[PDB]
Structures are given as C-alpha cells and as structure tokens.
Amino acid sequence: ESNIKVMCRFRPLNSEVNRGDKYIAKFQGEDTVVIASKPYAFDRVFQSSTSQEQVYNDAAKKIVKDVLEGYNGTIFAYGQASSGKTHTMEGKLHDPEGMGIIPRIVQDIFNYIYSMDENLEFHIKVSYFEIYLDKIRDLLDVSKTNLSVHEDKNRVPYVKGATERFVSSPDEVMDTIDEGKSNRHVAVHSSRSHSIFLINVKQENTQTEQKLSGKLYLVDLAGSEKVGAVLDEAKNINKSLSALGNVISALAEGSTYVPYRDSKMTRILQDSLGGNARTTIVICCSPSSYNESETKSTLLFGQRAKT
C-alpha cells in the first residue's frame, strides 16, 4: 500500500580493526540483520560484499524508470557519521563500479534520453536546497536563505523562489551538486541540515505531442543527535526527523490521515512520498562494536517505515 521500501547497508570494517573492534552483526538471509540477539527485518539488507551497482539496482533503478514514465519518487539517505552514507549516495565521481547512487541515477537518465533521441524531447530542471534550523535555504543562490513551501490549485507542492537550473549533461548535473555542497551547513564533517536535491524530468512526445513530467527527490538526512547554536541544530534536526518519521510511519501502517503539514520537508515531499509515489529509504550502518547504539539507533528509525 504505502510504497516505501527500507533497505539497510552495512559497510566493510576498516584501519578500524586496530582499535580492537568486533563485527557485532549477523545476517539471517538477505532481509534481516541480528544485533544483540534482536532481529531487524527490512526489504533488503546489503552485506559488506554488496557492490555499488547492485545497491543502485535494488534501491533506486526502478524509481528512476518510473520518473522517466511520468511518476514521482523519493530516495532517502540516513546514517550516523562514517556509516557509509556518502560512499553509498555519492561514491567515487568518475569510477563506474565505483560510483554511488546519485551518479548512477544521472547516467540512467541521460542514457535513456540519448537512446530516445527525436520522438522524445527533454527538459531537466534541477533544484537544490537544505532544511537548516527549520528554514528552507537555496544551495544555488546563497542570497535565498529563507524560502517557503506552498500548494497550487491542484494541491501540488512547490518551494517559492527556489532556483531551477536547466541541465543537458551528466557533468552539468554534477557541477550543480558540487556548487550546492559547497554551501551546505557542516560542523565538527557532520551535515547539521537535511539536503534535498530535485531532478524534474519534463518530456514531450514528438509523434503524439503529449507531455510527461516527473519529480525525483534525493534526500540526504542529517543523523539524530543526543546532546548554543549547535543545540538549536540538534533539536531542529531531531524534531524534523520525528516529523518525517510520523509521516513515514502513518503511510506504512495505512493511516487515512497522514501528517504532511507538521514539517516543511514533508510538505515539500507530499507529492513524492506516499500515494502513487515510489520511495526507497537507504539506511547506512557501521558494523563495529564501537557504534552499536548508533546502528541500533539507525535501525529503529528504518523500522518506522517498515509495514
């Protein structure tokens, strides 16, 4: 019903072994992981050996194909520091085996476009903003610090004043990602804000003249903090995570009312999370004994989306 799939990735272990740490995690097949004799069931659990490409294949690929066919979708990344969130989501820029989910999404989009030359015409608009201290901040125009979410006549959400930049190649998309990353709020390199990257795929069919439109959101979630300006960061981070969790949970349990309005991120993502929309949540975990509570913390958060 809900269309949310939660997938958990554990990374290989070192470099770190010199500390003295154990593996702490056992896998009952490919969808369940056991820690401290407690079982956590998911839709897929990627073990240490799982390649970048099959993470993309199982987590994101069908979502991309759906957006190229007119649907909306969302992929979330969630993880405590050094869990492998960045390796999973971005990976190694121009190494194909190699690269993480976001570069593979972009390559599939453009290969499809190239393979569909004349018969389909495309316009890809990308936007990039972060939820920092409950404020919507544009990562492509530092002057736009405090933007708002609204709904149109059809109850379709949009962020007012957000930069939309036209892109025509994979490099142009990646250039845009790097520009936004430069302005993203970091501390201690923890992300202190949640960042949302939007690819809007607009197409028109040359034979039939009919139009299609699809929105793919890539959300990098800041991890929950247990702790001045860094305190306001923690309470906002945590409150917005609980708002997401409430939505995500109401959809998973089939609630007829879903509390999208209780936070800005979920208002933005209302046309792309729940309903017809396709969603994958990738939670990244360290296997080390040193981080067992963090992992167990991440795992519980992932559990909220699990029917």
Residue numbers in the entry: 6 to 19, 21 to 194, 200 to 238, 245 to 324
Give the published text.
Kinesins are a family of microtubule-based motors that play important roles in intracellular transport and cell division. Kinesin-1 transports cargo within cells, a process tightly coupled with ATP hydrolysis. Whereas kinesin-1 in solution is mostly loaded with ADP, ADP release is accelerated several thousand-fold upon microtubule binding. Here we characterized kinesin-1 P-loop mutations that interfere with ADP binding and determined the structure of the corresponding mutated nucleotide-free kinesins.
